[PDB]
């Protein structure tokens, strides 16, 4: 049962999420239109490739954490 989609501007950047050498899938996140690889843990929490050791409760929280980590930098696909 996937999380709901989202779309907002967070610290000046557009973050979106939607149910769908990396893993399987389930849910997609984008930061300014560039896909952010994210992953769900068994307990329902999420991580992303920019915070891979620090679980957060939702994909929006993972998107926001990526924006905070990037400090304005574009993601690479």
């Amino acid at each position: 049962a996937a999380p709901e989609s989202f779309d907002e501007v967070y610290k000046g950047r557009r973050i979106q999420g939607r149910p769908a050498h990396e893993h399987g899938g389930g849910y997609e996140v984008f930061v300014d239109g560039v896909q952010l690889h994210v992953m769900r843990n068994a307990d329902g929490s999420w991580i992303s490739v920019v915070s891979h050791y620090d679980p957060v409760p939702t994909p929006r929280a993972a998107a926001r954490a990526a924006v905070d980590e990037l400090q304005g930098a574009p993601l690479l696909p």
Binding site: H21, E22, H23, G24, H37, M39, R40, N41, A42, D43, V49, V50, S51, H52, Y53, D54, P55, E69, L70, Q71, A73, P74, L75, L76
Partner: protein, 278 residues
């Protein structure tokens, strides 16, 4: 073939370690270790195939990955071994670890850029090539995202756990492996990645040379756990879908099993490892 606590290295040992790491970077070999690690942490999943992380093979896989890296170092300078970072003891940014003669310090607050040490971008000798964003400079924020490194007391609580691992053999598991990895409990290994910050907090964490020293100490705690629990051993021991059983081979090497890696003394010893005592 002795792995030593980083805090005890001599100036010549620090110098030779740094030079060997930089030569692996210059030759292109270093970045491929970064890429291998990223491919596994991005593919290992709690509900599917899992080998490098979030699974019982977390420990033997990183043991063999570090052995590959140590062997590559020794091809440049045979005297070099991986040192380990006991983050329960050396827990502040004024640890010698973070001095300009070794790994350099924390990142500046504007962009997290490491400004000193041999791996600072300004040296020209440490481009970040394998990356998840466009920044091409080493970053750290020591103690930024989490206040404290694990304490010795916390480490001792994890070492006391007798079972190596337990079904479902993933980030939800009870037992030693997952508590050392950090997904449950007081959190040892994951929290250290978070504490360093910068690339060490991401899938491309071997971009920071401290990766090797952190995992060398995680690997030493596995050895310490074995001595505490001579009656405990790797599990599962056969027939488990998606998980590396004891006598199954492991990707990417395909030619080695957890069973071949349980006894570190086949490859190296530590400066100090207490015997099974009671």
């Amino acid at each position: 073939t002795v792995r030593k606590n980083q805090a005890t290295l001599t100036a010549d040992e620090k110098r030779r370690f740094v030079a060997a790491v930089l030569e692996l970077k210059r030759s292109g070999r270093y970045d491929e270790f970064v890429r291998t690690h990223n491919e596994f942490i991005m593919s290992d999943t709690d509900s599917g195939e899992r080998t490098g992380h979030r699974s019982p093979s977390f420990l033997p896989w990183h043991r063999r990955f570090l052995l590959d890296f140590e062997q590559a170092l020794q091809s440049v300078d045979s005297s070099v071994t991986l040192p380990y970072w006991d983050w329960s003891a050396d827990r502040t940014v004024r640890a010698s670890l973070w001095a300009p003669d070794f790994l350099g310090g924390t990142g500046r607050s504007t962009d997290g850029r490491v400004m000193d040490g041999p791996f600072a971008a300004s040296t020209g000798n440490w481009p970040i090539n394998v990356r998840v964003d466009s920044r091409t400079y080493l970053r750290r924020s020591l103690g930024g995202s989490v206040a404290e490194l694990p304490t010795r007391a916390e480490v001792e609580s994890v070492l006391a756990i007798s079972a190596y691992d337990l079904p479902p053999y993933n980030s939800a598991s009870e037992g030693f492996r997952n508590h050392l990895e950090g997904w449950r409990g007081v959190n040892l290994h994951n929290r250290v990645h978070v504490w360093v910050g910068g690339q060490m907090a991401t899938g491309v964490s071997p971009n920071d040379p401290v990766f090797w020293l952190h995992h060398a100490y995680v690997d030493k705690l596995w050895a310490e756990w074995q001595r505490r629990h001579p009656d405990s051993a790797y599990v599962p021991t056969g027939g488990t879908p998606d998980v590396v059983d004891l006598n199954e081979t492991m990707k990417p090497w395909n030619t080695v099993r957890p069973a071949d890696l349980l006894d570190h003394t086949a490859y190296y010893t530590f400066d100090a490892l207490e015997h099974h005592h009671h």
